[PDB]
Design a protein around this ligand. Structure first.
Ligand code: CLA
Ligand code: CLA
Ligand code: CLA
Ligand code: CLA
Ligand code: CLA
Ligand code: CLA
Ligand code: CLA
Ligand code: CLA
Ligand code: CLA
Ligand SMILES: CC1=C(/C=C/C(C)=C/C=C/C(C)=C/C=C/C=C(C)/C=C/C=C(C)/C=C/C2=C(C)CCCC2(C)C)C(C)(C)CCC1
Ligand code: SF4
Lengths: 81, 80, 159, 143, 733, 33, 95, 69
């Protein structure tokens, strides 16, 4: 919660970034059949995005007002990763 | 015009003057080296400053040395 | 007939049809730039008259007020101004190139090898007379071009 | 007082159809560096003013533009054609200064009879700094 | 010397046209002029400084005169927030009637130019509420210019001709300059602010006819002589003050309440008065330091010979440094330009944040023009400081008179300095460009959550160390229990806190990862410009490639193609490439400034905080977006007031491209081209009559370098001025 | 007349002062003593 | 001798050698009429002193320029016509 | 003296000449001109060339100093 940054596991705009990217990749997914290679690759990228956002949530990253993970370099023990 | 100077580190290899396209230099006898000759620069008025002399001086830094100075019509290499 | 200048191959020029021919050399030799024998004042008068018309040309029809009623008058006025400036730069040229009384720096020789008289135009007083002729001729040519645009507007193009 | 100048006479010039790299007004008010050479045969050489010239069997004469032109020509002559050459300097007043060997020998053979000038009897690092010659005409290298 | 350069017979004996250029360019290099001395050098410098002061006062008088004659200042005083300043009128006879109609602003009967210099705000804050005031000021500054001119004339005459022993009096000069020229000068400025500017803010106009009668404080000088100075801080314009009228005003003249005036969003005039007073005390005390004709004081020579550390770390210390500075005018000039550039950047960094002029924070083009101005000026002044240090190391540095001293031990580890500055610049450029590119890609891959966003924890810590509660560090001023907050709890911190916490003003902006990255770009620029300049200065005397570089001077083209090649080897060329990197650095600084501020003023700080972390945001959301109203200054259908800024924009583009000609192309192609041209002119009939007097030649390499940099920098400056002024004026947020 | 003074001074300055200055400076360039 | 077979270095006639030739400078006499020549001589001899010509040119040209620009109205140059249009209020009120 | 005056042929030597490329760098003496009138007899051969692609240069006796190795 340092530097005025909310964590990403309890951020609103971070989840909004997630939803927006998922809707963007789904808009490009209603043009192919759900079993062909393009739709399978799009679904794989979708799961990649969702796990990416959830991993950035669970690591305790700090997401600012713009909703993107702001890395802390000061030397805080929580942010040595 | 330009001020060409030959320092006492010269080995007398005659490349400074065999490279000089304007007859500025000339080898003279000397007693400071095994070759018993050193370069001199009488005709510095004909010196354009191309530094072909010191691009052919095989010494630690240089023995011949061209100093850019008052540029006249012949040091500027003008046919007009 | 591209043999060199005066048959001299180590001079930087050639007697090609454009330079040294019976027609073009004659034309370049009987016009007021090269009339080395006549005094420079008449030469400058001729030169200034010609260039005054040549300058009034592209000031009336081409200019900021070409479409207005002030096209001819103000264009001729700008041409006279450019003429005054040209006499100005000619004047500083005559002052800067040769001082007061030296002999002419022009060649005293011709292609045929005759030791001709030097062109007194290149002297100080000669160039001054040439500049005076240029100014007089140029203002006169400007006002005469204005007069011809005034009284004889119909044969010339308006567009 | 061992080698006199040669005082080039009215020799013929090479056969050349004329170029634009020739003598401009510099010759008409300043020097123009005549060169003289002596050919064994009527052969063809590159002119320093651009273009090809046909040198004449025997003595030749060329008035090109400047010192570097005649010396480049003479070096090409001596290296490619193995020919003795000598060139001059012709001021507009009339004097003809002899310049290339100035001793009858080219300026590579250290032949005695030439005084050494432009000669600083030291290594090149032992020149004084400019502050030591501040406000003096001698810049750094004339002591 | 026979021809135009009377100061160098080597250029007068030059039949070419290089002599004109080199007589222009070396006109002011007195210590290279022929047949001169140190006396004449210092005296010409003194007369030149008089001429510079004359030009400065004349230019200020022109500003005042044109604002009084052609301006709308009397209208700006009434409604400053909603009346546009006017620099000067315009009579351009090339103008078309649409342009006469568009450039008619500020309630003028003719075309005008809007004063983006802020002179209106600064004149209005110091009194000067009529055109007659500005007329009197302009006439007095004209008198001062004539005064400087006659002074510099007579100080050249043999009767009034100071000797070099007088110029070298570096202790009397220091004492006098400190005490008078700073302390008494700021004291007189306080005596203006207390007698004129504050009364002009508090209402009544105090002018020369009635400034002896008007008490600046109702108890005149009793509080000062009796020590009761607190009586000058009783009614400090308690937060309802309208600048220029007695409503909500007070009686104080000297305060430390800090913060900003609420109406003007500027600093209090009483704070400025007390400030200039306090620093006047400090400078008047410090100017009684150095030894003079009265027996007491310090000798800087022994101050330097005494500051030699035992241990030999610095070696011979500062021994022999007084003599190598006082004799060396280039060392004085280098130190002076160092300090001047740093304080110029300080002027910028503190006028954007702590504006000391009424209604300059709320107007938005002057606050950007001034910052950009003073920062480019500071960058140039800094490049010049280093260049003159290089010129010192060549011309005026005597290695024997300062052997093994701080300066000599300095030149020893020049390779260490150059290598570690190279490391810093290489590290910064590598990393920060990599991060900007990573973010460019992560946006280009639609994954902005993967960006390298480093929150600037240290600058945010300093901000929270000054009272900014936008981060929650609560340390030394945001913590109420901190003793630093408790000390100034009753002096300045209420105003300073309601200023720094107010997110409308521009001091201590809320910074984010883009600010971190562009600050590191700035560090790259500073370290790299420093690298180039320091390397040129330390290799000015020589290196391994050219050890006798001191003998060739500071400015020489090269040393030939031998030894691999020696293009741009001189310290002048280090200065050159450093001017390039300086323009780049200040461009980064001012781009950062202008975008952060235009986003703050528009309201969408999120635009910067989201888009500044990837370079396509700067190319799209700053350059492409804010250039919308500029390039449309004149369309195929009509024009507007920003036509001049678009024309200047393209003009600067043009010269910035023309510089690439002199930089990329070098001398030889142009000499050959001029040889062909000379052939043609000497064999073209009717122009054979005309023969030049100076034999035409292509520009010398060092010259053409300088010319390319002149075009390059003129284009940099004019382009960014056009863009900044037009973007901040097309909207004013 | 104050509105007519730019019309006198701008054509004066920006055209004549170049005439005077550039002419006199070209003469100062092309000089010999 | 300059006219010998391929000889171009007559050291006496250095003009023919260096190329000093009036390439088109005809020395033919005045082709103008004498009367108009005398007319132009008498009517342009005032412009014989180059210094007085320069002073006259600069001063009279500057005078005529100032006269034209001061007596000309807005009909011939829009800058003197003035706005003849109401002023637009700038952004953010006028600031 | 007719015996050698300078370092031995092969003695790795240091350069005290401030203007040379190999300043404060070691060398390898390949020859010493025993004529007692030349100014720079010490012909050194270094390992790395200078900017002119030259690995050898003449040095004086006082502009040279042998190392303890
Ligand atoms: C706007 C340009 C311009 C124009 C239209 C003229 C026009 C004229 N000049 Mg002027 N002149 C000019 C510029 C100009 N001049 C400049 C810059 C100088 C200074 C060198 C002079 C110096 C000068 C002298 C000294 C004289 C003239 C003369 C002339 C007249 C006939 C000779 C001529 O020009 O053909 C000759 C043209 C050439 C030699 C150029 C040949 C180059 C090629 C082959 C032509 C290319 C043209 C093609 C369309 C492109 C003619 C009225 C003569 C005159 O006034 O007689 C009354 C005369 O004696 N001129
Ligand atoms: C931009 C080019 C330009 C323009 C717009 C004009 C325009 C004009 N010229 Mg000029 N002219 C020009 C170039 C130009 N001239 C050139 C290059 C020459 C050759 C040197 C001439 C030679 C010329 C002559 C000889 C005459 C004109 C005349 C004229 C006018 C009527 C033509 C019918 C008109 C004002 C005529 C006139 O009397 O003007 C009023 C006329 O007699 N012109
Ligand atoms: C107290 C006596 C005194 C005073 C007042 C001065 C005053 C001055 N001397 Mg000095 N001088 C003195 C004694 C004095 N001298 C003595 C005894 C000697 C004996 C050796 C000299 C020798 C000497 C030399 C050799 C030279 C001078 C020069 C100068 C001038 C410096 C240039 C300038 O105006 O910038 C003045 C700058 C400031 C007042 C302030 C600069 C920095 C501040 C901190 C910046 C921040 C505030 C900023 C100003 C705010 C601006 C806001 C807005 C209003 C724009 C100045 C007039 C130079 C000159 O011009 O020659 C005439 C010069 O070359 N002096
Ligand atoms: C160089 C600066 C300067 C100068 C020339 C003056 C000059 C003057 N002051 Mg001012 N004054 C100044 C600085 C200055 N003051 C400063 C810095 C302060 C704040 C400490 C004041 C506060 C002040 C007061 C409060 C009064 C004066 C007064 C006066 C006048 C009579 C003093 C005896 C005189 C015109 C007196 C007056 O009537 O005017 C008066 O009552 N001065
Ligand atoms: C207090 C400020 C100050 C002062 C007094 C000087 C004074 C001087 N400088 Mg320094 N200089 C300064 C600021 C200053 N400069 C700044 C800010 C820079 C960075 C741009 C430089 C960069 C600089 C370099 C790189 C060089 C000098 C040189 C010189 C000397 C000759 C200048 C000359 O005649 O050129 C006259 C210049 C012009 C007529 C045209 C310049 C082009 C611009 C575009 C015009 C504006 C002179 C001692 C030269 C020197 O000492 O030679 C060894 C030199 O090589 N200066
Ligand atoms: C063995 C490799 C090696 C080592 C140990 C060093 C060590 C050093 N270099 Mg150098 N450097 C090297 C290679 C090396 N460099 C190469 C190949 C280049 C050309 C790109 C440079 C270019 C360079 C510059 C321009 C600068 C340094 C600097 C430095 C210093 C700071 C370290 C730094 O910032 O990294 C610098 C690293 C780079 C710029 C990236 C290049 C490094 C490459 C990737 C390593 C090459 C390894 C090699 C090919 C593998 C062979 C393995 C072998 C078993 C076969 C340090 C003394 C700086 C300095 O002097 O400041 C004190 C400085 O300014 N170096
Ligand atoms: C965008 C243009 C640009 C860039 C990138 C640079 C970059 C640099 N300049 Mg500057 N410079 C420029 C323009 C530029 N300059 C201009 C216009 C001039 C005027 C002539 C100068 C004048 C100048 C001087 C005078 C000096 C520099 C210095 C430097 C170096 C500073 C150290 C640093 O930050 O490097 C970090 C590295 C980089 C910025 C390189 C970026 C490229 C990446 C990292 C390479 C890897 C990409 C890829 C994997 C490689 C493969 C590519 C391809 C073959 C497949 C660096 C190489 C200084 C120096 O050398 O200090 C060490 C120095 O003294 N430059
Ligand atoms: C360096 C200071 C400075 C600057 C940059 C300007 C700039 C300008 N002035 Mg101003 N001016 C100044 C000082 C200055 N002035 C002073 C001190 C005076 C009083 C003598 C004037 C009196 C003045 C008048 C009367 C006029 C200008 C005008 C102009 C403009 C055209 C140039 C001209 O003809 O000026 C002429 C200026 C002088 C000869 C004074 C030089 C000292 C231009 C915007 C003209 C204008 O309004 O155009 C819009 C105009 O008519 N100026
Ligand atoms: C053809 C293009 C052109 C030209 C020639 C002009 C001409 C002019 N404009 Mg501009 N203008 C133009 C297009 C043009 N305009 C366009 C397209 C716009 C956009 C719509 C404008 C917008 C505009 C504004 C907004 C203003 C002008 C002004 C001016 C006048 C400036 C006064 C002066 O004499 O300057 C003198 C020249 C300078 C100050 C330049 C200084 C730099 C020089 C090059 C260096 C000098 C070298 C050296 C130190 C001195 C030696 C002597 C030297 C003579 C050689 C002048 C009449 C101003 C005006 O009317 O005020 C009177 C003004 O405020 N113009
Ligand atoms: C080349 C050369 C030269 C020049 C140089 C230069 C130009 C330099 C510059 C430099 C610079 C430009 C520098 C800067 C610096 C800075 C600093 C060093 C800073 C510091 C700071 C501090 C210390 C702070 C403190 C504080 C704070 C933090 C805030 C608050 C307050 C206080 C005070 C507490 C010379 C001539 C010299 C000589 C020769 C060589
Ligand atoms: S090139 Fe150098 S070492 Fe060789 S002869 Fe000439 S001066 Fe002597």
């Amino acid at each position: 919660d340092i530097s005025g940054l909310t964590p990403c596991k309890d951020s609103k705009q971070f989840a909004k970034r997630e939803k927006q990217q998922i809707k963007k990749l789904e808009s490009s997914l209603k043009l192919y059949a759900p079993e062909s290679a393009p739709a399978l690759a799009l679904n794989a990228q979708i799961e990649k995005t969702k796990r990416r956002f959830d991993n950035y949530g669970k690591y305790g990253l700090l997401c600012g007002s713009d909703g993107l993970p702001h890395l802390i370099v000061n030397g805080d023990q929580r942010h040595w990763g | 015009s330009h001020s060409v100077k030959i320092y006492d580190t010269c080995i007398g290899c005659t490349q400074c003057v065999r490279a000089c396209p304007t007859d500025v230099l000339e080898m003279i006898p000397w007693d400071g080296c095994k070759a018993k000759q050193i370069a001199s620069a009488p005709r510095t008025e004909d010196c354009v400053g191309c530094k072909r002399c010191e691009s052919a001086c095989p010494t630690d830094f240089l023995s011949v040395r061209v100093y850019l100075w008052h540029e006249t019509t012949r040091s500027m290499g003008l046919a007009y | 007939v591209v043999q060199p200048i005066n048959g001299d191959p180590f001079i930087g020029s050639l007697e090609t049809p454009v330079t040294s021919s019976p027609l073009i050399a004659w034309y370049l030799s009987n016009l007021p730039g090269y009339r080395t024998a006549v005094n420079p004042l008449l030469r400058g008068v001729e030169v200034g008259l010609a260039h005054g018309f040549f300058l009034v040309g592209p000031f009336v029809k081409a200019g900021p007020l070409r479409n207005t009623a002030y096209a001819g008058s103000a264009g001729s006025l700008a041409a006279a101004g450019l003429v005054v400036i040209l006499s100005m730069c000619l004047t500083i040229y005559g002052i800067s190139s040769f001082k007061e009384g030296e002999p002419s720096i022009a060649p005293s020789l011709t292609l045929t090898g005759r030791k001709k008289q030097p062109d007194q135009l290149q002297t100080a007083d000669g160039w001054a007379k040439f500049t005076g002729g240029f100014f007089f001729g140029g203002i006169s040519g400007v006002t005469w071009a204005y007069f011809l645009l005034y009284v004889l507007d119909l044969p010339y193009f308006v567009k | 007082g061992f080698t006199p100048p040669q005082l080039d006479p009215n020799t013929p010039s090479p056969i050349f159809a004329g170029s634009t790299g020739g003598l401009l007004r510099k010759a008409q008010v300043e020097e123009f560096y005549v060169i003289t050479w002596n050919s064994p045969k009527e052969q063809i050489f590159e002119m320093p003013t651009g273009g090809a010239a046909i040198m004449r069997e025997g003595p030749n004469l060329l008035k090109l533009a400047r010192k570097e032109q005649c010396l480049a020509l003479g070096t090409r002559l001596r290296s490619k054609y193995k020919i003795t050459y000598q060139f001059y300097r012709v001021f507009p007043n009339g004097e003809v200064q002899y310049l290339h060997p100035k001793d009858g020998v080219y300026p590579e053979k250290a032949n005695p009879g030439r005084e050494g000038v432009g000669l600083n009897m030291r290594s090149i690092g032992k020149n004084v700094s400019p502050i030591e010659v501040k406000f003096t005409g001698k810049q750094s290298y004339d002591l | 010397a026979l021809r135009f350069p009377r100061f160098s017979q080597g250029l007068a004996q030059d039949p070419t046209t290089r002599r004109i250029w080199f007589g222009i360019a070396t006109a002011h290099d007195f210590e290279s002029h022929d047949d001169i001395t140190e006396e004449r050098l210092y005296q010409n410098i003194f007369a030149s400084h008089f001429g510079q002061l004359a030009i400065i006062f004349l230019w200020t008088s022109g500003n005042l005169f044109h604002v009084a004659w052609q301006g709308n200042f009397e209208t700006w005083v009434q409604d400053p927030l909603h009346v546009r300043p006017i620099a000067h009128a315009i009579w351009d006879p090339h103008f078309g009637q649409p342009a006469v109609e568009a450039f008619t602003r500020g309630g003028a009967l003719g075309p005008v130019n809007i004063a983006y210099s802020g002179v209106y705000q600064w004149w209005y804050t110091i009194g000067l509420r009529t055109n007659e005031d500005l007329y009197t000021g302009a006439l007095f500054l004209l008198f001062l210019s004539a005064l400087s001119l006659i002074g510099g004339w007579l100080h050249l005459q043999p009767k009034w001709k100071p000797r070099v022993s007088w110029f070298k009096n570096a202790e009397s000069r220091l004492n006098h300059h400190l005490s008078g020229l700073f302390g008494v000068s700021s004291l007189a400025w306080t005596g203006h602010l207390v007698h004129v500017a504050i009364p002009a803010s508090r209402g009544e106009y105090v002018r020369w006819n009635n400034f002896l009668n008007v008490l600046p404080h109702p108890q005149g000088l009793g509080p000062l002589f009796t020590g009761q100075w607190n009586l000058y801080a009783q009614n400090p314009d308690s937060s309802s003050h309208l600048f220029g009228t007695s409503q909500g005003s007070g009686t104080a003249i000297l305060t430390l309440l800090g913060g900003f005036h609420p109406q003007t969003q500027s600093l209090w005039l009483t704070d400025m008065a007390h400030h200039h007073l306090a620093i006047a005390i400090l400078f008047l005390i410090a100017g009684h330091m150095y030894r003079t004709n009265f027996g007491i004081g310090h000798s800087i020579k022994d101050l330097l010979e005494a500051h030699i550390p035992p241990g030999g770390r610095l070696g011979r210390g500062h021994k022999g440094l007084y003599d190598t500075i006082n004799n060396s005018i280039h060392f004085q000039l280098g130190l002076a330009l160092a300090s001047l550039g740093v304080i110029t950047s300080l002027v910028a960094q503190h006028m954007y944040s702590l504006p000391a002029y009424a209604f300059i924070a709320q107007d938005f083009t002057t606050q950007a023009a001034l910052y950009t101005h003073h920062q480019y000026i500071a960058g140039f002044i800094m490049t010049g400081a280093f260049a003159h240090g290089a010129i010192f190391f060549i011309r005026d540095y005597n290695p024997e008179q300062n052997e093994d001293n701080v300066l000599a031990r300095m030149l020893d580890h020049k390779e260490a300095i150059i290598s570690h500055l190279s490391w810093a610049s290489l590290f910064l450029g590598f990393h920060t460009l990599g991060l900007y590119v990573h973010n460019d890609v992560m946006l280009a891959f639609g994954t902005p959550e993967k960006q390298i966003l480093i929150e600037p924890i240290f600058a945010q810590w300093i901000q929270s160390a000054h009272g900014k509660t936008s981060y929650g560090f609560d340390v030394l001023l945001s913590s109420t229990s901190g003793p630093a907050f408790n000390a100034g709890r009753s002096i300045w911190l209420p105003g300073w806190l309601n200023a720094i916490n107010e997110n409308s003003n521009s001091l201590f902006l809320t910074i984010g990862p883009g600010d971190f990255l562009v600050h590191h770009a700035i560090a790259l620029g500073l370290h790299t410009t420093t690298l180039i300049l320091v390397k040129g200065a330390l290799d000015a005397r020589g290196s391994k490639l050219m050890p006798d570089k001191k003998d060739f001077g500071y400015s020489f083209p090269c040393d030939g193609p031998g030894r691999g090649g020696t293009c741009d080897i001189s310290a002048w060329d280090a200065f050159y490439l450093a001017v390039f990197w300086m323009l780049n650095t200040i461009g980064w600084v001012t781009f950062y400034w202008h975008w952060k501020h235009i986003t703050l003023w528009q309201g969408n700080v999120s635009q910067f905080n989201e888009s500044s972390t990837y370079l396509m945001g700067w190319l799209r959301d700053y350059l492409w977006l804010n250039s919308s109203q500029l390039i449309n200054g004149y369309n195929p259908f009509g024009m507007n007031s920003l036509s001049v800024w678009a024309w200047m924009f393209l003009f600067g583009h043009l010269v910035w491209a023309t510089g690439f000609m002199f930089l990329i192309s070098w001398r030889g192609y142009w000499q050959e081209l001029i040889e062909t041209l000379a052939w043609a002119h000497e064999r073209t009939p009717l122009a054979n009559l005309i023969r030049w007097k100076d034999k035409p030649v292509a520009l010398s390499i060092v010259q053409a370098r300088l010319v390319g940099l002149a075009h390059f920098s003129v284009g940099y400056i004019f382009t960014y001025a056009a863009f900044l002024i037009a973007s901040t004026s097309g909207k004013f947020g | 007349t104050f509105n007519n003074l730019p019309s006198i001074f701008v054509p004066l300055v920006g055209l004549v002062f170049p005439a005077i200055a550039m002419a006199s400076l070209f003469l100062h360039i092309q000089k010999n003593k | 001798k300059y006219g010998d077979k391929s000889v171009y270095f007559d050291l006496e006639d250095l003009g023919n050698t260096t190329g000093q030739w009036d390439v088109y400078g005809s020395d033919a006499p005045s082709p103008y009429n004498p009367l108009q020549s005398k007319f132009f001589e008498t009517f342009a001899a005032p412009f014989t002193k180059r210094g007085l010509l320069l002073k006259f040119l600069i001063l009279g040209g500057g005078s005529l320029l100032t006269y034209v620009s001061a007596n000309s109205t807005g009909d011939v140059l829009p800058i003197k016509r003035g706005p003849q249009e109401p002023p637009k209020l700038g952004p953010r009120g006028k600031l | 003296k007719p015996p050698p005056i300078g370092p031995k042929r092969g003695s790795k030597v240091k350069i005290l000449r401030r203007e040379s490329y190999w300043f404060k760098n070691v060398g390898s003496v390949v020859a010493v001109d025993q004529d007692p009138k030349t100014r720079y007899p010490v012909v050194v051969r270094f390992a790395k060339v200078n900017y002119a692609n030259i690995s050898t240069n003449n040095y004086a006796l006082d502009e040279v100093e042998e190392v303890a190795a």
